Amino acid sequence: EVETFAFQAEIAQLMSLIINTFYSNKEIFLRELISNSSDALDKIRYESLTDPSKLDSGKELHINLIPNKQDRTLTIVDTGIGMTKADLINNLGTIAKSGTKAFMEALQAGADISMIGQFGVGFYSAYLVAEKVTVITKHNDDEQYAWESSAGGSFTVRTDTGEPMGRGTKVILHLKEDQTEYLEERRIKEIVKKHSQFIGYPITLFVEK
Ligand SMILES: CNC(=S)Nc1ccc(F)cc1F
């Protein structure tokens, strides 16, 4: 049972701008997704300060980076607060309509795509390097869901029958054919050291057979 939704016009416009603008500094997608994971981890940590049972779904607070060259995927896993179905549909828990408006206003006032995270829509920088993005998520107050989009104006949401995650979010980047440098260990390490050196959660880069 799969539900298909239209993006709001402004988000479709943001995604087409990210996909079609010539902009060589694509590596910032990873900084933006790690920053989103850190924000999600901060949220569940804050809730746990007054209600420890919020961590019954998992006490460890971390970020894993999992490249898979066979599948041509880079997955960013975190054990943060996750998202409900309603959050997923409402632009993955962002204020993306007003964030896109602010981002566009900034781009015409000198900004570049790398500043996208300052406008709360850094998730969509995934489409700098991915032809398709799958988001698997589990929030304490809802069931596990999979969101997916290859852009083109629509996204899908379905109940996820995959491996249970406990709590958190997994962003699966199905990389464009010419963006496979982001599966190479040395390239991912370089990006994490350059842009994510002060993130307050352990970031583990998995290796492959
Ligand atoms: C009321 N909001 C304002 S003033 N926002 C705003 C956003 C991006 C800019 F580049 C300039 C801006 F003024």
Curated annotation (Swiss-Prot):
> Which domain of life does this protein belong to?
Eukaryota
> Which residues does the record give as ATP binding sites?
36, 78, 97, 123
Q: Where in the cell is it found?
A: Nucleus; Cytoplasm; Melanosome; Cell membrane
Explain the post-translational modification.
Answer: ISGylated. S-nitrosylated; negatively regulates the ATPase activity and the activation of eNOS by HSP90AA1.
Q: What is the effect of changing residue 82 to D?
A: Abolishes ATPase activity
Per the record, which residues fall in region Interaction with NR3C1?
1-209
Q: Which residues carry this modification: N6-acetyllysine?
A: 43, 69
Q: What does this protein do?
A: Molecular chaperone that promotes the maturation, structural maintenance and proper regulation of specific target proteins involved for instance in cell cycle control and signal transduction. Undergoes a functional cycle that is linked to its ATPase activity which is essential for its chaperone activity. This cycle probably induces conformational changes in the client proteins, thereby causing their activation. Interacts dynamically with various co-chaperones that modulate its substrate recognition, ATPase cycle and chaperone function. (Microbial infection) Seems to interfere with N.meningitidis NadA-mediated invasion of human cells. Decreasing HSP90 levels increases adhesion and entry of E.coli expressing NadA into human Chang cells; increasing its levels leads to decreased adhesion and invasion.
UniProt comment concerning the protein's domains: The TPR repeat-binding motif mediates interaction with TPR repeat-containing proteins like the co-chaperone STUB1.
Instruction: Give the quaternary structure.
Output: Homodimer. Identified in NR3C1/GCR steroid receptor-chaperone complexes formed at least by NR3C1, HSP90AA1 and a variety of proteins containing TPR repeats such as FKBP4, FKBP5, PPID, PPP5C or STIP1. Forms a complex containing HSP90AA1, TSC1 and TSC2; TSC1 is required to recruit TCS2 to the complex. The closed form interacts (via the middle domain and TPR repeat-binding motif) with co-chaperone TSC1 (via C-terminus). Interacts with TOM34. Interacts with TERT; the interaction, together with PTGES3, is required for correct assembly and stabilization of the TERT holoenzyme complex. (Microbial infection) Interacts with herpes simplex virus 1 protein US11; this interaction inhibits TBK1-induced interferon production.
Q: Which family does it belong to?
A: Belongs to the heat shock protein 90 family.
* Protein name per the record: Heat shock protein HSP 90-alpha
Which span of the entire protein is present here? 16 to 224 of 732
